[PDB]
A paper describes a structure:
In bacteria, Ser/Thr protein kinase-like sequences are found as part of large multidomain polypeptides that biosynthesize lanthipeptides, a class of natural products distinguished by the presence of thioether cross-links. The kinase domain phosphorylates Ser or Thr residues in the peptide substrates. Subsequent β-elimination by a lyase domain yields electrophilic dehydroamino acids, which can undergo cyclase domain-catalyzed cyclization to yield conformationally restricted, bioactive compounds. We also describe the first crystal structures of a class III lanthipeptide synthetase, consisting of the lyase, kinase, and cyclase domains, in various states including complexes with its leader peptide and nucleotide.
To compare the consequences of leader peptide binding on the structure of ThurKC, we carried out numerous attempts to produce the enzyme in the absence of the leader peptide, with no success. Expression of ThurKC in the absence of the leader peptide resulted in an impure protein that was prone to aggregation. Eventually, we were able to grow crystals of ThurKC that were purified with the leader but with most of the peptide removed during purification. The resultant 2.52 Å resolution structure does not show any density for the leader peptide at the binding site but may contain trace amounts that remained throughout the purification process. The structure of this “leaderless” ThurKC shows density for the activation segment and catalytic loops in conformations similar to that observed in the structure of LP-(GS)7-ThurKC. However, a comparison of the respective C-lobes of the two structures reveals that the N-lobe of “leaderless” ThurKC is shifted away from the C-lobe. This movement opens the ATP and peptide-binding sites that are sandwiched between the two lobes. Although there are no changes in the orientation of secondary structural elements that define the activated conformation, the relative movement of the N- and C-lobes in the absence of the leader peptide shifts active site residues too far away to productively interact with ATP and presumably the peptide substrate. The displacement of the N- and C-lobes results in significant movements of both the lyase domain and the cyclase domain. Many of the residues that stabilize interactions between the three domains are displaced and incapable for interaction in the “leaderless” ThurKC structure.
Numbering used by the authors: 4 to 21, 29 to 178, 190 to 213, 223 to 863
Amino acid sequence: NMLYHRYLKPNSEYYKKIIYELNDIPDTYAVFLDNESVWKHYHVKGSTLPEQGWKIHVTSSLEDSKDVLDKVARLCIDKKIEFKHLKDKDSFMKMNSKNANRASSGKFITIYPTNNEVFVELLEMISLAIQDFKKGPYILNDKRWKNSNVFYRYGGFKGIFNEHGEHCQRNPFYQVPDFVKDFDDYLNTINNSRLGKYKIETALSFSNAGGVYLATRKKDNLKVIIKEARPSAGLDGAAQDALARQKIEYDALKKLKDVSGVVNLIEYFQEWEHYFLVEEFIEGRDLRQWIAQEFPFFEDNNGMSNHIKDVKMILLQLLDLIDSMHNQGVAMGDLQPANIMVTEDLTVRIIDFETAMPVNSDDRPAMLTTGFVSHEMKVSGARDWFGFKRLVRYLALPVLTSEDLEGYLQYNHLNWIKENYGYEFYSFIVDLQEKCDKRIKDYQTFIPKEINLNDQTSDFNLTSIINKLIIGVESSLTNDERFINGDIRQFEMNGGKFNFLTGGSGAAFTLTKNKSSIAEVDKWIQSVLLDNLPLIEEDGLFTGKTGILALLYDKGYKEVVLNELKILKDNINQTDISIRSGLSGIGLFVISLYLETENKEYLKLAKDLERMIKLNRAKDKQLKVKDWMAVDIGVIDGLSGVSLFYSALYSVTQNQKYLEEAEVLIKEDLESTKKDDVTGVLQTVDNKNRLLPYLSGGSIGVAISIWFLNHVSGQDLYREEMNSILKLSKTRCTISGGLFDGAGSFLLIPSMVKNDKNREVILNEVLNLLNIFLIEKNSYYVYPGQFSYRLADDVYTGSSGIILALMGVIKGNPLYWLPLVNSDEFLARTKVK
């Protein structure tokens, strides 16, 4: 999810992507680099090393980090010792940023002396060469010498990979082996309170920069936040350490001690070698959390006026607070929902000022929160106001957007606010907006956009939406190998450029269903794709070859598909049973091919795949998840998905066993659901205890599997659960718009509803949701990808997924997003009898 930032290349509506070598190496060394690892390996001579011994770590500050590798590595070659170091300055940053993992932070060079003797031998003569230098980050994993950047401790050298996941331990603190404890006592002997007035209960968070600690002042009982900043550790894009940031938080907290909204400074001192900022411990939630917990996501016809109250209250306080801050010449330089807190009585507080900057300064900040920023703002104070301006609309409609799409989605958003709230609240928002507009004009020449709401209208005609999204896709063909722009996964994942989920086949399949762009599709299939087939190892329905084979077969490439089918069993991944990428998805494809060709060899293969699924299930009951957005419940990556396979297999088999299995797999997924007490809506429960509606990981997925179970068998099982899931149609707003993870999921609800009067309401509800996202551009429609930061045309997040869902509604086909052979006939062919 944080990966998205890497794909916000300037001046594009699409997701597009934006060394420590030594001097004169002796031939006695083998050098291994890394397009994978952070480590640049140095193997010495020919002989390998002990599995575990005492190792030396060398840390280094930034100012001159090159002068510490130019020296230490050469004594690692004078004595001919084995070592490894970070690849590049870039890799240095990842290990030594605020963000970095403390466990192995600081570690720049790792030296491997064999054991005991050469270790102490080395550790001394290193410190003679690197003694006249700036100190680097202390490694909280190791022990230190004097004022030395030389560290040490015991651990494995070349970590084996075992059953429980060895790596032979590196922990946030210091440790001792129960084995070689004796030699530990040796070096012990060669090696040469202000916060005592606080009782530290617990720590909220730690980081590479330091901890944040809940403490009660010794005899006073006042709860305080204690913010640690250890020097030179936790670097910024700006190359500023934890300290420099802390002594900017300090300056600001005083300078606005008079503002009662701002957190109040208690004290600020030094200790061991660290620096501590003590502040007043505030109770409530950030606006992100407040929105998550308090926003009326479910549409009840008992009004939404309560929320209008609280928003108006919160925003006005915030308007005051920002004015106060700007009086004192300080801009809180990251104005966005994370940094605004709000107590149980809804008192607006600002808590972190590490990003504070003098208003009137035109310096690029270290950190920009996409969604609450614009490249138009060139001055610190104006950045605050723009933040607030966007935050204003956000509390009304909590749906992120980037500057690249804001030109479109402001229409959709503002129109939504009116249609759903009073005109009074619409006009409140739009006034407070323009109230911000020229608080900006104070700091900089800013000539704002003139918005007329009647220039964009929301669309509820399925044929119109499908037609216009198609015309969009046709107008948006890349002339390259991807065919369409899509999610970042086109670049991040194997086969992502070609597969059904994020690649060209998704669009080509969709365009084919709408009889559009035949020549463009034929060109892409012939010039690209067929040549890329041999390079896609994965067989997955969405992620790999099988979804592509569906496209290919429909388009007339029997010979290719039939040869692929011959190869399909022989080498088949068997650890994975999901619809996304495992045996269920493949099996579903294989059954569809059976139905189309009536070749009984495909039925046999389908039964072989089932046996593999049975085996996998027996082996262990833990599902394996490869995508970072994958969740082991529901239709895409869990057991509901596998039930799709059993149901389909049942249809071509008439064998009750498969039907009973289909049922059991749904039952199992239903155990991880939770019915809400107020609103009677059923959702799935994540492992992170998140509640999910979406097609990917959510209850809409489970409903689809119930529907298909019922479709093949002529039953009406799980009606109670079903009815509780269709109630999700009352959802207003979602984080994102896409079929898998966003609004598009909800389009699948109406396609499951038999009677029309009930359907038409549900359809209208879900089209209200779609219309937050559906972008009018030129004469046609396009669609925002994940987080509405850029447009996407793929199935996973973009317009192709929407089109398929919408055609699903028309056809009463909740399975229409699956890339199956034929598929216009699939329901008819799998129906009961």
